[PDB]
Design a protein around this ligand. Structure first.
Ligand SMILES: N[C@@H](CSCC[B-](O)(O)O)C(=O)O
Ligand SMILES: N[C@@H](CSCC[B-](O)(O)O)C(=O)O
Ligand SMILES: N[C@@H](CSCC[B-](O)(O)O)C(=O)O
Ligand SMILES: [Mn+2]
Ligand SMILES: [Mn+2]
Ligand SMILES: [Mn+2]
Ligand SMILES: [Mn+2]
Ligand SMILES: [Mn+2]
Ligand SMILES: [Mn+2]
Lengths: 309, 309, 309
C-alpha cells in the first residue's frame, strides 16, 4: 500500500511566535497515529527531531536565526531521505513553514523528479534580500527554486542547500497575501498559482483538475504537498501565526487532499504553521487541530463518501 | 396547482434522543401553514398521527424499539397513501428519519413509480445485521430497497414492508459519514450518490442537473425527497441528533429544493431529524427551525428571485 | 491610469434608520484614502456634500421625505458629473441606496452610454405607487429606468429626473428578497439578473463572465457599479439596515469587484447602505466597515494574487 514515515519537528526560529513547536505534540495527542492506523497504512514514527538551539546565531542583515533555521532544515533534510529511503511517504508535522526547505530537500535527494503543491495563503518566496519582515518562514521557496539560484545570497546555515525544484514544477493553492516582490517573482518566473481569485472563478473542482494535469501531464512523478494551515480561512484554522480572511473552506481543504490522495503519487507531506498557543478559546485550538487531522487523513485515504476493506 | 397534505409525526423511538418529536410542534408554531398559504397551495392538515407506545417492545438482537418503529411507519404508510389519494403532495414533518420507511411506503402504494432524493449527511442504509449503534433511524433505506431484500432479516414490526424502490431509483445528496458497511452497499449496488466530495467537485449547480437527469431521464415519474436536517452544516441546523461538519450551505440547501420544485414532479416530502431540545442557545433552535421552514417553502414555490400572481 | 473622484454623502432620509449617514465618516476614518493611494491612483476628495434638511417635507401619498431625497440626488447628480468631468471615476460612499438616482444621473449626464451593475440583495425597483413600506431607498431604479417612465408618478423633488438607463442595460447580482411587484417588473421588462439562485447554479465564476459579456458584448461602454453592502451575507456585513441571509461570501464580493476592475471600464462607483450604529458588538462595525474597504480597493486594483510597480 502506502507506508507512512512520521517526523516530528518542533521548530519555531523561522518566525517570531514559538508556540508553533507545539504542533507535533498536539497533533500526536489528538490521536493522529491511531486514526491513520484505523485506515490502511504502516505508520512509521521516526519521532521528533531534537533541535539544539544555536547559542550564537546572529542575523544575516535582517534575517534572524539563519543558522538555527538552516540546520533544522538540514537535519530534517537528512531524515526525510531516510523515510523515502525506507520506501515510505514522508509526513512532517512541522512548526513554522521554514522547515519546507528541509522536507523538500531530503525528499528530492531521493526523488529529484517530484512535483510540489504549495497550499498556503502566502507564497513564501521572499529572498534574504527581499524579505521585509525578515522572517525565514516566508522565504522557503526561494531557497528551493532553481531559477532563483543566483538571486539568493550566501547566508549562514545553508551552504548545503542545492536548488532542487524548478519554476515549472510547483503549484500554489490558496494565495491571498503576496508581497509586492513575491508577486513580481510569481509573474516573472511564470509560476503556476491558483490564488483565491481563481478558486472563486474555477471552483475547487476545476482548480484540482488543472493543478494535477499541469503537474502530472507529461509524466507521473512523485508529489510533495507542503500544507500551511493558514491556507484555510481563520474560522477553520484560527490558531496560526499569520492568518488571512477569505480562505479555503473546510470542505475545500478536504477536496484538495482527497484528490491528491486519489492520484496515489503523494511521496511527501508536511503539516505546518499550527500554533495552539495563538488560539483564543480552548476550542479554537481544538478547531484548528482537529481540522488539521481531518486533512492529513484525507491525504492517506479517508474519503467523505466512505471506505471499507 | 399543487395541493399539500400535512401529516405530523412526533416519533423518536428510531433513535436515542426523544426531543425529535418536537418537530411537528415547533415547525407548525413557526408559522409553516400560513407561509405555505401565502404562496399558491391548498394545505391539507391531516394532523399529527397519534402513536401509542408499545408496552413490550424488546429488541431484535441489538435493534431497539423494532415494533414501536415498524408500526409508526405502518401507521404513517397508510396515511401517506390517503393524501396521495386525495391527489395531494405528502408533507411529513417527522421526528427521526426512521419514519422514512413509512412515508415512502404509502407514497409508493400509490405511485410505485416514484424516484427518491435522499438529502442527508448519512446514507441510512444499514441492515438489522450491519447496524453497529443499532438505531433504526439509520437503516430506513435497507428496508425499502429491492436489491437488499434477502439481506434484511425478519424483524418484529415490519412483516408489512415490501421493498418498493430499486437501487437505480434513489439519489443521495450531502453524504459525509458513511459506515464501512454502508459504503460497501453503496458501491456494490451501484447507487447514485453525491457525497460532499462531489458537491465540491461539481458545485451544486451541476449536482442538481445530474441528479434530476439521472432520475428523470428516461421517464417523468413522481419524486420523493427525504430531507434530513443534518444534511446541512451544523452552523445552519445545529439542533439535530447526529450533525457533521463540512455540510451543505444555507444557499445550497435552497438550490436543491428550488430545483426540485421547478420540475413540478414532487409528490412526497419529509422534513426529518430536527430536535429543538438538542440546541444550545434558544436562537440555535430558531436557527435550525427557521432554516427548515426556509427549505420547505422553496419546495413549494418560494424562490429567492421572487414570485407573484 | 484611473483617477478617483470622492464624494461623501451622509444622507439617510431615503429610509428610517439615520445612522447610515455615518458611512463616509467611518469609511474615511478606516483609512480609505491612504489605502487607495498605496495603490496606483490620483484620489480626488471632493468632500462630503452638505445636505440642508427640508423643513416642510410632507409625504407624497406614503412616500416619506420625497423632496429631501430628490434634492440629495439632484445635488449629488451635479457633483458626479463634475468628477466625471475632471476625467475621474466617481466614488460615492453613500448613506442609503436612494442616492443611486443621483449618482447614476450625473454620471449619465456625462456618459449617457454607461452600463450598470446593481449588486444588492434587493432590486430597489419599486415605484411610488408599488412601494409598500414606502421608503425611497428601495425605489431608485424605477426613477432611472426608461421603460418605467410613465409608470412613475409626479413626485415632489424629482422634476429634474430624466430616465437615463434602459432595461437592457442593467444587471442585478445578489438578489434574494424581491417584492411581488418588483418581481413582476423584473420578468416583464426582461431585466438581466443573477439572484442567489443563479450564483448557486453558475458559481460566481460564470456569473461574472455572463454579466460582463451581456453588458460589454456589442460595445465597450462605461460601467457603473452600484454596491449595496447588504448584497453580502450579514456575517460579513451585519451593520446594514436591511440584511438577508444566504448572501454573497467575502470571497464572492471580492471576485465581482476584481473582475469589474479588470475590465477597466469602471466609471462610477457607490458604496451604500452601511450603518455602523446598527451593528451589535463594536467589532461587527469593524467587520462591516473593513469588508467594505476590502471591496472598494479591489475595484481600484487590489488583487488577492498580488500587485507591484
Ligand atoms: N509576506 C510575509 C509572509 S509570512 C508567511 C507565513 B507562512 O509560512 O505561514 O506562509 C513575509 O515576508 O514574512
Ligand atoms: N451510521 C449511523 C447513522 S445515524 C443516521 C442518522 B440520520 O437519520 O439522521 O441520518 C448508524 O449506524 O446509526
Ligand atoms: N422591498 C423593500 C426594499 S428595501 C431595499 C433596501 B436597500 O436599498 O438596501 O436595497 C421595500 O419596498 O422597501
Ligand atoms: Mn507558509
Ligand atoms: Mn501561510
Ligand atoms: Mn437520516
Ligand atoms: Mn442524517
Ligand atoms: Mn439597495
Ligand atoms: Mn439592499
Amino acid at each position: 500500500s502506502r507506508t507512512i514515515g512520521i517526523i516530528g519537528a518542533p521548530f519555531s526560529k523561522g518566525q517570531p511566535r514559538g508556540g508553533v513547536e507545539e504542533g507535533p505534540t498536539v497533533l500526536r495527542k489528538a490521536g493522529l497515529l491511531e486514526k491513520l492506523k484505523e485506515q490502511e497504512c504502516d505508520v512509521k514514527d521516526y519521532g521528533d527531531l531534537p533541535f539544539a538551539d544555536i547559542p550564537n546565531d546572529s542575523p544575516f542583515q535582517i534575517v534572524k536565526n539563519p543558522r538555527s533555521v538552516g540546520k533544522a532544515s538540514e537535519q530534517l533534510a537528512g531524515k526525510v531521505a531516510e523515510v523515502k529511503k525506507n520506501g515510505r511517504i514522508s509526513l512532517v508535522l512541522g512548526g513554522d513553514h521554514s522547515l519546507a526547505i528541509g522536507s523538500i530537500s531530503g525528499h528530492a535527494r531521493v526523488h529529484p523528479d517530484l512535483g510540489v503543491i504549495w497550499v498556503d495563503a502566502h507564497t513564501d518566496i521572499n529572498t534574504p534580500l527581499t524579505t521585509t519582515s525578515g522572517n525565514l518562514h516566508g522565504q522557503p521557496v526561494s531557497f528551493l527554486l532553481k531559477e532563483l539560484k543566483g538571486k539568493i545570497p550566501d547566508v549562514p546555515g545553508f551552504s548545503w542547500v542545492t536548488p532542487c525544484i524548478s519554476a515549472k514544477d510547483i503549484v500554489y493553492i490558496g494565495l491571498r497575501d503576496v508581497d509586492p516582490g513575491e508577486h513580481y517573482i510569481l509573474k516573472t518566473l511564470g509560476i503556476k498559482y491558483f490564488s483565491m481569485t481563481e478558486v472563486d472563478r474555477l471552483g475547487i473542482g476545476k482548480v484540482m483538475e488543472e493543478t494535477l494535469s499541469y503537474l502530472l501531464g507529461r509524466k507521473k512523478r512523485p508529489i510533495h504537498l507542503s500544507f500551511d494551515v493558514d491556507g484555510l480561512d481563520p474560522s477553520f484554522t484560527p490558531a496560526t501565526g499569520t492568518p488571512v480572511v477569505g480562505g479555503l473552506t473546510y470542505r475545500q481543504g478536504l477536496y484538495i487532499t482527497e484528490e491528491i490522495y486519489k492520484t496515489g503519487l503523494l511521496s511527501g507531506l508536511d503539516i505546518m504553521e499550527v500554533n495552539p498557543s495563538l488560539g483564543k478559546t480552548p476550542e479554537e485550538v481544538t478547531r484548528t487541530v482537529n481540522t488539521a487531522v481531518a486533512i492529513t487523513l484525507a491525504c492517506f485515504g479517508l474519503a467523505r463518501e466512505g471506505n471499507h476493506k
